[PDB]
């Protein structure tokens, strides 16, 4: 016996019951897909900046 094929009925109500939540923007986002050459240089840049800041404590 044939039945219903598809409907989006009630789907927006279900989604809005717990709401459509914006995805929690952060500071310092992930560097996952960032250019690996840039990431390799940025690691050393952060190392040097931390070293300089620590040495500045005299």
């Amino acid at each position: 016996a044939k039945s219903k094929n598809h409907t989006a009925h009630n789907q927006t109500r279900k989604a809005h019951r717990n709401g459509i939540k914006k995805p929690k923007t952060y500071k310092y986002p992930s560097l996952k897909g960032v250019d690996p050459k840039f990431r390799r240089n940025h690691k050393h840049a952060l190392h040097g900046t931390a070293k300089a800041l620590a040495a500045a404590k005299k």
Partner: protein
Amino acid sequence: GKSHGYRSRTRYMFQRDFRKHGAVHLSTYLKVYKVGDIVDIKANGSIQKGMPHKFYQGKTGVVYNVTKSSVGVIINKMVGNRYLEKRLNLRVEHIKHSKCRQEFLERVKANAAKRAEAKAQGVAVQLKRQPAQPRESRIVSTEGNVPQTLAPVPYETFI
């Protein structure tokens, strides 16, 4: 059977903007995109590489990565009942700087300048935008503008 390909239902979406076909002008390549820039996505049909999916046509996102000929764009795509972070690798032909934020940066500059000039002149800020207010009172003169009386016209066909 059904058909849902990568470029399905893109027939008019990926057209070449009638009488603007052919080579992409050089300003598109001369634009410079930095991480944190806000860009609108509009696919160029003549550039098949680095092309965005049809879903991201007209979406505005943030550049998170910069490569030789492409940028990485962050889009918040609504999936079910929440937004998922999507990272698109788009050649510069399919993106442009969003003017929804250059105007905002100009407004920020103007606000800072106005705050400086106000702290120099006196005590007033009024730095927030306000909606269109109801109109103040006005006096309308009839000098040379005697009100002309109109009436509804009778029906006629003129066919």
